Amino acid sequence: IVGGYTCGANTVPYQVSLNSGYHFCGGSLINSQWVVSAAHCYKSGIQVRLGEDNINVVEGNEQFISASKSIVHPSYNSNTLNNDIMLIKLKSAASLNSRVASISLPTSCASAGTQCLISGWGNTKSSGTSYPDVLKCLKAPILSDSSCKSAYPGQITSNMFCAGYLEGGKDSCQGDSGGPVVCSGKLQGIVSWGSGCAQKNKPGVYTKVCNYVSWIKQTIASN
Numbered sequence: 001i002v003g004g005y006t007c008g009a010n011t012v013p014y015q016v017s018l019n020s021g022y023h024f025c026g027g028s029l030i031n032s033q034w035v036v037s038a039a040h041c042y043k044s045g046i047q048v049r050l051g052e053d054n055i056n057v058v059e060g061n062e063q064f065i066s067a068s069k070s071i072v073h074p075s076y077n078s079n080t081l082n083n084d085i086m087l088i089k090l091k092s093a094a095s096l097n098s099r100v101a102s103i104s105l106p107t108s109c110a111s112a113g114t115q116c117l118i119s120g121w122g123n124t125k126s127s128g129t130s131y132p133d134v135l136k137c138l139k140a141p142i143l144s145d146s147s148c149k150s151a152y153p154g155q156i157t158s159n160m161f162c163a164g165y166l167e168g169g170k171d172s173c174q175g176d177s178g179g180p181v182v183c184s185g186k187l188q189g190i191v192s193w194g195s196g197c198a199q200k201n202k203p204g205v206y207t208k209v210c211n212y213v214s215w216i217k218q219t220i221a222s223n
C-alpha cells in the first residue's frame with residue numbers, strides 16, 4: 001500500500017497473509033473454512049495466516065492453517081487477468097473471534113464513488129521498494145468505468161473496476177495482490193493489477209467480486 005496508514009492490530013480481522021515460506025499475497029476470510037484471493041496468487045504449498053499484524057513477529061493472536069485445496073476460477077485468463085479470483089479451502093476451520101472474522105460477500109455491486117478500504121503488506125513506495133511488517137490500509141474511491149477504460153484502453157473487462165487517485169500518490173501495490181477491497185461492509189474487490197503503483201493516470205485495477213458470488217456459493221457448497 002502506497003500512501004496509506006497503519007491499520008492498527010487486528011482491526012481488519014478478515015485480512016489474511018498467504019505464506020509459502022514468506023508472505024507473497026493477501027486474501028480475505030469469507031467463512032471459517034474458506035479464503036478468497038487472486039488467481040494470479042496461485043501457488044502450491046500455501047499456509048494461510050490469520051490474525052496477523054506484524055507478519056515477522058508472533059504477537060499471540062495468529063492462526064496458521066495449511067490450505068487443503070486451491071480452486072482457480074474456471075475461466076481465469078493469466079494473460080489478460082480476466083476472472084482473477086481463486087478460492088482456498090483450509091485444512092481445519094478457523095476459530096472465529098474478535099481478531100479473526102469473516103467478511104460478507106456482496107449482494108449487489110458497489111457504487112462508483114464509494115470510499116472503500118484496501119489493505120495489505122505490499123510495497124509502500126512508488127519508485128523504490130520497502131515492504132512493511134505491519135498491516136497497512138488505504139481508503140480509496142471506486143472510479144467510473146469510463147475513466148477506468150480510458151486509463152487502460154482495450155484491457156478493462158466487465159469483471160474489473162478501477163479504484164484510487166488519478167493524480168498519483170495512493171495505491172495498492174505488489175505484495176497486496178489477492179487482498180480485500182471492502183465497501184459498505186462487503187468484499188467488493190480483490191487486488192489484481194495496475195501499471196506500476198501510485199502513478200499518475202494509472203489507477204489500481206480490482207477483480208469485481210459481485211460478478212462471482214454464484215460461483216463462490218456453488219463452489220463452497222460442493223467442496
Ligand SMILES: [Ca+2]
Nearest residue numbers: 054057058059
Ligand atoms: Ca505475527
